Copies of this chain bind each other. A is one copy, B any other.
Amino acid sequence: VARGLEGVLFTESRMCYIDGQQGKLYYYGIPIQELAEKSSFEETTFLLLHGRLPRRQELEEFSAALARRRALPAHLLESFKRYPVSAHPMSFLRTAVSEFGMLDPTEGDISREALYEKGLDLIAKFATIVAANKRLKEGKEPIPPREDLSHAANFLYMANGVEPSPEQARLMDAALILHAEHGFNASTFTAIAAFSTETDLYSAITAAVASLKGPRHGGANEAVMRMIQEIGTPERAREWVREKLAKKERIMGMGHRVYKAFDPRAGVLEKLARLVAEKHGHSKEYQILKIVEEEAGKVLNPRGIYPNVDFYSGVVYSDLGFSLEFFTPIFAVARISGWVGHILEYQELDNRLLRPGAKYVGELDVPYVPLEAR
């Protein structure tokens, strides 16, 4: 019995190479650090769906294609008015994707080309859905997308009601690129497991959202923000760290389960976060984070325990206007590209129905006892 399917390889892939021991992460062979620094969510999405970087003309048309698809149908925006505002944002997203599928006249078409086109629609619309949820949570109206803005800049615009600075847009753009893909994690696997019966794309993506909503996957930066809230103020941060280390207690965001050395995604984000802080000001959360980074680093750096991407992303989203409950939704806004890419790849290279089993340890030949005899 292969508990948790640990060590089990069930298919082949060309999408994501992960070497946790050496700190390497590639998207179709290209290092994530290069993409986060030089690419855009649109270009990286093209890479994840096509397997190669786009030529200039291809990128322009691709970005425009996504931009035109950002707006949600009026039918869905109307439904959002009654979606419980008190509900978990991931449940809002889960329902939105499912209901949206009902509006597709050819919802069940799963030809490669149909999956690709419906996929572009979902990639463009995810940011709009999440931003709408945020606006409604604030008692405000969702904001129509601005096609002149990039996917990342428009996401911030629709979420906050104001166009972000170039620095803020670049920070969010990098964050999305950094979380767009990560191999066969739980949500990507669930998407494939669902798609293996040849169900429609909305069904597979709804299953992915359902998986991602779980605390065991896609919620790492929540623990870091909870730590920051526990610290409360910058003035107590340094002392808090000392006490934690003295008690041999773990510091959230330090070290990683997969990346034994450096998390290849952390560096670019830390730098861009600094640039935003220097232009827009250092938030209370940012100040606390930097003190923890420095004080904890004095002891952890020599031990090879470095801050990972989750150590920075939560503060980044907070600084960009988002609350903790929207962290996983933002993760989904990025990961939808990886999910679509994985569905296209699985269909192309494997496409088999998944048929795992379980070792039977139950009983046999148990009698159907008459009701009165029990």
Contact = CB atoms under 8 A, between A and B. Distances in A.
Interface string A161-197: 0000000000000000000000110110110011111
B374 A54 contact: yes
Contact of A88 (B38, B107, B214, B352): B107
A196 B216 CA distance: 8
B184 A197 contact: no
A363 B12 CA distance: 13
Contact of A91 (B101, B368, B374): B101
A358 B1 CA distance: 18
A76 to B, nearest CB: 10
Given A56-B372, A193-B190, A210-B207, A184 B10 contact: no
A61 B365 CA distance: 27
A10 B14 contact: no
A198 B186 contact: no
Contacts of A339: none
A102 B91 contact: yes
B79 A107 contact: no
A248 interface: no
Contact of A362 (B17, B55, B368): B17
Contacts of A8: 2, 5, 8, 10, 356-357
Interface in A111-149: none
A342 to B, nearest CB: 10
A316 to B, nearest CB: 23
Contacts of A372: 56
Interface stretch (A92-100, A226-234, A267-275, A305-313): A92-100
Interface of A: 1-17, 26, 28-31, 34-35, 38-39, 53-56, 59, 75, 78-79, 82-84, 86-88, 90-92, 94-95, 98-99, 101-103, 105, 107-108, 183-184, 186-187, 189-190, 193-200, 202-204, 206-207, 209-218, 350, 352-369, 371-372, 374
4 nearest A-B residue pairs (beta carbon): A197-B214, A29-B366, A14-B362, A199-B214
